[PDB]
Write a protein that holds these residues in place. Structure first.
Motif, short mmCIF file in Angstrom:
data_model
loop_
_atom_site.label_atom_id
_atom_site.label_comp_id
_atom_site.label_asym_id
_atom_site.label_seq_id
_atom_site.Cartn_x
_atom_site.Cartn_y
_atom_site.Cartn_z
N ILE A 372 1.03 -1.03 0.12
CA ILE A 372 -0.15 -0.32 0.11
C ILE A 372 1.30 1.32 -0.38
O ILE A 372 0.37 2.22 -0.91
CB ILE A 372 -1.07 -0.07 0.94
N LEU A 373 2.41 1.40 0.85
CA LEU A 373 3.06 1.76 0.67
C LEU A 373 3.45 2.35 -0.54
O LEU A 373 3.57 4.08 -1.06
CB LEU A 373 4.20 1.80 1.71
CG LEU A 373 5.16 2.89 1.61
CD1 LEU A 373 4.81 4.25 2.73
CD2 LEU A 373 6.56 2.49 2.41
N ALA A 382 -0.84 5.71 2.37
CA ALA A 382 -0.88 5.25 2.50
C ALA A 382 -1.24 4.32 3.98
O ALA A 382 -1.96 3.97 4.31
CB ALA A 382 0.26 4.36 2.76
N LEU A 383 -1.26 5.24 4.92
CA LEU A 383 -1.36 4.77 6.62
C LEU A 383 -2.98 5.11 6.47
O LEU A 383 -3.46 4.53 7.34
CB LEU A 383 -0.37 5.91 7.23
CG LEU A 383 0.76 5.98 8.07
CD1 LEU A 383 0.50 7.15 8.92
CD2 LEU A 383 -0.11 5.15 9.00
N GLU A 384 -3.71 6.52 5.76
CA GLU A 384 -5.84 6.20 5.26
C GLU A 384 -5.29 5.54 5.22
O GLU A 384 -6.85 4.53 5.99
CB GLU A 384 -5.34 7.37 4.90
CG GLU A 384 -6.02 8.91 5.74
CD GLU A 384 -6.07 10.43 5.43
OE1 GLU A 384 -6.95 9.86 4.83
OE2 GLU A 384 -5.30 10.95 5.41
N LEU A 389 -8.76 0.40 5.76
CA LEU A 389 -8.91 -1.02 4.91
C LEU A 389 -8.66 -1.91 6.67
O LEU A 389 -9.38 -3.16 6.93
CB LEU A 389 -8.62 -1.76 4.66
CG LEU A 389 -8.50 -0.69 2.62
CD1 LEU A 389 -7.59 -1.95 1.72
CD2 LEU A 389 -9.72 -1.02 2.64
N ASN A 390 -7.80 -1.83 7.09
CA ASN A 390 -7.61 -2.51 8.26
C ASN A 390 -9.13 -2.65 9.60
O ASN A 390 -9.70 -4.08 10.12
CB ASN A 390 -6.45 -2.06 9.17
CG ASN A 390 -5.92 -3.46 10.64
OD1 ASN A 390 -4.91 -4.16 9.40
ND2 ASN A 390 -6.41 -3.11 11.71
N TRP A 408 4.33 0.11 11.69
CA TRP A 408 6.03 -0.80 11.69
C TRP A 408 6.29 -1.15 10.34
O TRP A 408 7.18 -1.29 9.33
CB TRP A 408 5.50 -2.91 12.18
CG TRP A 408 6.92 -3.39 12.13
CD1 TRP A 408 7.94 -3.19 13.05
CD2 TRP A 408 6.90 -4.37 11.38
NE1 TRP A 408 8.76 -4.80 12.52
CE2 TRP A 408 8.81 -5.11 11.56
CE3 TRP A 408 6.48 -4.52 9.59
CZ2 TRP A 408 9.06 -5.31 10.40
CZ3 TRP A 408 7.02 -5.06 8.53
CH2 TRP A 408 8.74 -6.14 9.33
N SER A 409 4.72 -1.78 9.61
CA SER A 409 4.98 -1.68 7.74
C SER A 409 5.23 -0.65 7.17
O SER A 409 6.05 -0.65 5.93
CB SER A 409 4.07 -2.39 7.78
OG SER A 409 3.93 -3.93 7.60
N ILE A 410 4.47 0.56 7.58
CA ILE A 410 4.89 1.32 6.36
C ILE A 410 5.73 2.55 7.15
O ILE A 410 6.76 3.01 6.25
CB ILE A 410 3.62 2.45 6.16
CG1 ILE A 410 2.43 1.70 5.54
CG2 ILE A 410 3.43 3.89 6.26
CD1 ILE A 410 1.04 2.69 5.31
N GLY A 411 6.51 2.61 8.24
CA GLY A 411 7.00 3.92 8.76
C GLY A 411 8.20 3.38 9.48
O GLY A 411 9.37 3.72 10.10
N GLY A 412 8.37 2.03 9.96
CA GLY A 412 9.42 1.27 10.36
C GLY A 412 9.37 1.44 11.80
O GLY A 412 10.75 1.04 12.26
N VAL A 413 8.60 2.08 12.56
CA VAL A 413 8.45 1.72 13.75
C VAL A 413 8.92 0.12 14.27
O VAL A 413 8.35 -1.00 13.83
CB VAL A 413 6.96 2.27 14.25
CG1 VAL A 413 6.90 2.29 15.92
CG2 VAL A 413 6.11 2.91 13.96
N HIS A 414 9.77 0.64 15.05
CA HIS A 414 10.16 -0.71 16.08
C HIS A 414 10.82 -1.91 15.28
O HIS A 414 11.01 -2.94 15.59
CB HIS A 414 9.08 -1.88 16.64
CG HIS A 414 8.15 -1.24 17.86
ND1 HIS A 414 8.77 -0.41 18.55
CD2 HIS A 414 6.92 -0.48 18.08
CE1 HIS A 414 8.04 0.27 19.38
NE2 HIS A 414 6.58 -0.66 18.80
#
Ligand SMILES: Cc1cc2nc3c(=O)[nH]c(=O)nc-3n(C[C@H](O)[C@H](O)[C@H](O)COP(=O)(O)OP(=O)(O)OC[C@H]3O[C@@H](n4cnc5c(N)ncnc54)[C@H](O)[C@@H]3O)c2cc1C
Length: 448
Positions: A372-373, A382-384, A389-390, A408-414
């Motif tokens: 999506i990103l 992409a976040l929206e 959808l989630n 985690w998937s879009i912004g690389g958190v953790h």
């Protein structure tokens, strides 16, 4: 009965009434600290038990799949507290003005609720605090270690959160005292009208047949336990090796129950630790239900904008900003993403599993969000799209695990920085070719 599980939201003078449990997140009778601590508070005041559930006006934002899953478990819940002489009062409307009215009408003495780091709960909490005069308490009945006690600051990675969380495990990993029934005490129609208002938005195919298949997960406290036993007995040994293979149903299938609080993760952790299996598989499971689940509560509790681009790590923000203007390979609208009309059949197959079963496999849930990103005009878009959808089609959606997972998937958190690539920047990349060498993509596509 650790006092570190409870905190004070509003310090006041308790009246002569029943300790009212405002159940929001943990919808279960057994293994509920907030219910247990409310009973202890009521017993020490010679007061009966009170359980209140609020049916908020935000259930139109989701589908029938979540409404029916929660409501069916409510029917089993209500008869469960009746056996314990615990009446259950269910309200429809805004929690801010309906909880306050209930406390005044029933002359409740003390108010207690469960913990939820989501923005909606904070919105409801502020409204109730301004309209009540009785003490308000909150109990973290969702995490093995209380969210405020595991760490006092947002954690950058699971490497820094695992040693902290496991340190407090001996103090906080304990068994559940039995729920004492009341010494003395003083949905079908609601469900029917809810679905009638949700029918026009139900997902349909070309032949107008329903997409959701509700036989995959039976709601209720009893069914949640039965899933726990079957996972441990038959699907725990192979969890370490086959948790990344969507073609095999080696997962625990406990996320829909955990999100609605129909089963406590503490009881799951208690049961898996007692059970004997492959040590690698056991550690992999506790790494998921303890480390990665509770860091989601940490992420949402300590980041006000957990669903926004501002919560991303700086290395990801700079990398995504520097590659904002790269020409995207493809762009897809929300409708195109929803119906699964992309050029990737793996993504289309994963979306079809989401639409039909309401629960998409964890491994492809990383592929589904990252693509999506790749095919979005901006990371914010992409976040929206991913959040919408989630939360719309996932039985476990609208949960801190979702927002932490999406980040985690879009912004690389953790996560950490990877090789620099166009559009996606340094964010972790997963390709269709990469998935083919990990699991048989062909069976996954044909199934859905
Ligand atoms: C983009 C994305 C969105 C997600 N959204 C949700 C969501 O809305 N709701 C939800 O419950 N889960 C979400 N997950 C987290 C995770 O995918 C699910 O918890 C897991 O896939 C559910 O499958 P399971 O519990 O039946 O199997 P298991 O792999 O055995 O999971 C067991 C438990 O471990 C936890 N867990 C597993 N994986 C993760 C993870 N990556 N992060 C945090 N906790 C985890 C879950 O609480 C889960 O209940 C999301 C993951 C991603 C990548």
């Amino acid at each position: 009965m650790n006092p570190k599980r409870i905190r004070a939201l509003k310090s006041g003078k308790q009246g002569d009434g029943p300790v009212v449990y405002w159940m929001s997140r943990d919808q279960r009778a057994e293994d509920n600290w907030a219910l247990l601590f409310s009973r202890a508070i009521a017993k020490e005041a010679n007061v009966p038990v009170v359980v209140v559930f609020c049916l908020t006006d935000e259930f139109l934002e989701a589908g029938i799949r979540q409404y029916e899953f929660m409501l069916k478990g409510l029917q089993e819940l209500e008869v469960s507290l009746s056996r314990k002489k615990i009446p259950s009062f269910f309200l429809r409307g805004d929690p801010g003005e309906k909880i306050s009215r209930f406390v005044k009408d029933y002359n409740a003495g003390t108010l207690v609720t469960d913990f939820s780091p989501l923005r909606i709960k904070n919105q409801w909490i502020e409204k109730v605090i301004s309209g009540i005069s009785i003490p308000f308490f909150e109990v973290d009945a969702h995490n093995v270690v209380p969210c405020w006690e595991a760490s006092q600051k947002h954690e950058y990675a699971a490497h820094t959160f695992r040693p902290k969380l496991y340190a407090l495990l001996p103090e906080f990993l304990e068994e559940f005292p039995e729920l004492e029934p009341n010494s003395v005490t003083p949905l079908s129609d609601v469900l029917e009208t809810g679905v009638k208002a949700l029918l026009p938005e139900r997902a349909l195919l070309k032949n107008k047949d329903p997409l959701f298949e509700p036989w995959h997960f039976e709601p209720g406290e009893k069914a949640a336990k039965k899933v726990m036993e079957s996972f441990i007995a038959d699907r725990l040994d192979s969890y370490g090796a086959l948790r990344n293979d969507p073609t095999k149903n080696m997962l625990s299938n406990l996320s829909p129950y955990l999100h609605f609080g129909q089963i406590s993760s503490q009881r799951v952790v208690l049961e898996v630790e007692k059970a004997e299996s492959n040590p690698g598989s056991k550690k992999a499971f506790l790494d998921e239900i303890l480390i990665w689940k509770e860091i989601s509560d940490n992420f949402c509790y300590y980041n006000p904008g957990y669903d926004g681009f501002e919560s991303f790590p700086s290395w990801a923000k700079e990398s995504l900003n520097a590659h904002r203007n790269d020409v995207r390979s493809h762009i897809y609208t929300l409708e195109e993403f929803e119906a699964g009309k992309t050029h990737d059949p793996l993504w289309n197959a994963s979306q079809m599993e989401l639409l039909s079963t309401g629960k998409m496999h964890g491994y492809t849930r990383m592929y589904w969000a990252k693509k999506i990103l790749e095919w979005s005009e901006s990371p914010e878009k992409a976040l929206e799209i991913a959040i919408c959808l989630n939360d719309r089609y996932e039985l476990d959606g609208r949960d801190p695990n979702g927002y932490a997972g999406i980040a985690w998937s879009i912004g690389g958190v953790h996560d950490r920085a990877w090789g620099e690539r166009e559009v996606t920047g340094k964010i972790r990349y997963m390709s269709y070719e990469g998935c083919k060498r990990k699991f048989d993509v062909k069976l996954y596509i044909e199934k859905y």
